[PDB]
Design an enzyme around this catalytic site. Sequence first.
Site, mmCIF file in Angstrom:
data_model
loop_
_atom_site.group_PDB
_atom_site.id
_atom_site.type_symbol
_atom_site.label_atom_id
_atom_site.label_comp_id
_atom_site.label_asym_id
_atom_site.label_seq_id
_atom_site.Cartn_x
_atom_site.Cartn_y
_atom_site.Cartn_z
ATOM 1 N N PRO A 152 0.835 -1.226 0.000
ATOM 2 C CA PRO A 152 0.000 0.000 0.000
ATOM 3 C C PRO A 152 0.854 1.254 0.000
ATOM 4 O O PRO A 152 1.969 1.262 0.528
ATOM 5 C CB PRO A 152 -0.887 -0.066 1.231
ATOM 6 C CG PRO A 152 -1.066 -1.580 1.364
ATOM 7 C CD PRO A 152 0.328 -2.172 1.011
ATOM 8 N N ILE A 179 -3.156 -2.994 -3.689
ATOM 9 C CA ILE A 179 -3.567 -4.096 -4.552
ATOM 10 C C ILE A 179 -4.566 -4.816 -3.659
ATOM 11 O O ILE A 179 -4.182 -5.582 -2.778
ATOM 12 C CB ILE A 179 -2.378 -5.027 -4.890
ATOM 13 C CG1 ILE A 179 -1.363 -4.272 -5.760
ATOM 14 C CG2 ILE A 179 -2.887 -6.281 -5.613
ATOM 15 C CD1 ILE A 179 -0.029 -4.995 -5.930
#
Lengths: 114, 114, 114
Positions: free
Chosen positions: C1, C64
């Site tokens: 992240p 993701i």
Amino acid sequence: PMFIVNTNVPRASVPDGFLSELTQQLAQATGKPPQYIAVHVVPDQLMAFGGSSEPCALCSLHSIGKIGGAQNRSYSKLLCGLLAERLRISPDRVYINYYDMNAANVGWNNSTFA
Amino acid sequence: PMFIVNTNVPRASVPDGFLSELTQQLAQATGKPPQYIAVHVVPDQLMAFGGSSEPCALCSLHSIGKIGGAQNRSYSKLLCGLLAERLRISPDRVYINYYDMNAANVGWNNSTFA
Amino acid sequence: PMFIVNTNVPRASVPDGFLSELTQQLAQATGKPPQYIAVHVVPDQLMAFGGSSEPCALCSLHSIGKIGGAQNRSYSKLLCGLLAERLRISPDRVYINYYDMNAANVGWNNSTFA
Ligand SMILES: O=C(O/N=C/c1ccc(O)cc1)C1CCCCC1
Ligand SMILES: O=C(O/N=C\c1ccc(O)cc1)C1CCCCC1
């Protein structure tokens, strides 16, 4: 809506009131109230366009809706016009990435807009 | 195409010609003429990777097409390679976000592509 | 992240431990090990929010997976809380764009996550 301008033109070349002008012009172009408009200008950047260091700008306009084929052409004319007039940047040395944001992917005041 | 690299490496550590090399290497990699390649380098940033302040970089590559599984792996090898050799940034402290832009969502020269 | 914060708050007002605090809190919020978290804070920015130059922030969180309607509503509370306390920014002057990235579109360590 959120508009960001990254440019190699010097900070001193940014007219006082430029952020206010952008805010007002975007509120009019998007039809969104000015209270939801955010603008960000980043001068003195180390960048090149086509391998040249002459004035240029890399921008982005994020919005929940109000993003489309015809609307984006209109925004481009409006925005390139302002960059040419206020920052003396040639329109052909400007890239503007447009993003149609899903309301669930835009956070604001402890929640999202969904 | 446009490539942006944000890094905590100091400005003095960016070698002369870095933007020119990025322009040339990306033109070759994407198959697009150098004239449409835009590069932006932002050093001295306040950032961390994995909670460490060691050299790192957060990048993005936007392009209308030429974005995909195999191509992105190739761009990553090329770009991490450049960041490691020129800026001394370890490949595992680099993130590169890839964006396949729809032509209608890219403004340039008072209009949009497509 | 990856979390990025652009703000008009002065560099001197950004706590030295803010990047580490964000790293730790985001690791917990996303359920990912801290080593996967990258943070970037950009102060002293020339910006306006709703036509006002009071403290504000334009942010982005890329990941993701771990991005969605409910998760984003939760992240907004976590982040507005951190920005409000550490940077003294009113939560209604904060925009956070969330991006759910495809593994194939995220480069790292000479390759991508796909
Ligand atoms: O403010 C934005 O655009 N839309 C505003 C808006 C207007 C009206 C609504 O009911 C909800 C949201 C966001 C700014 C950050 C990037 C995504 C769009
Ligand atoms: O791919 C890009 O290049 N720009 C223009 C251009 C010129 C020639 C092409 O064949 C295609 C596109 C854009 C750069 C700005 C971010 C979106 C992609």
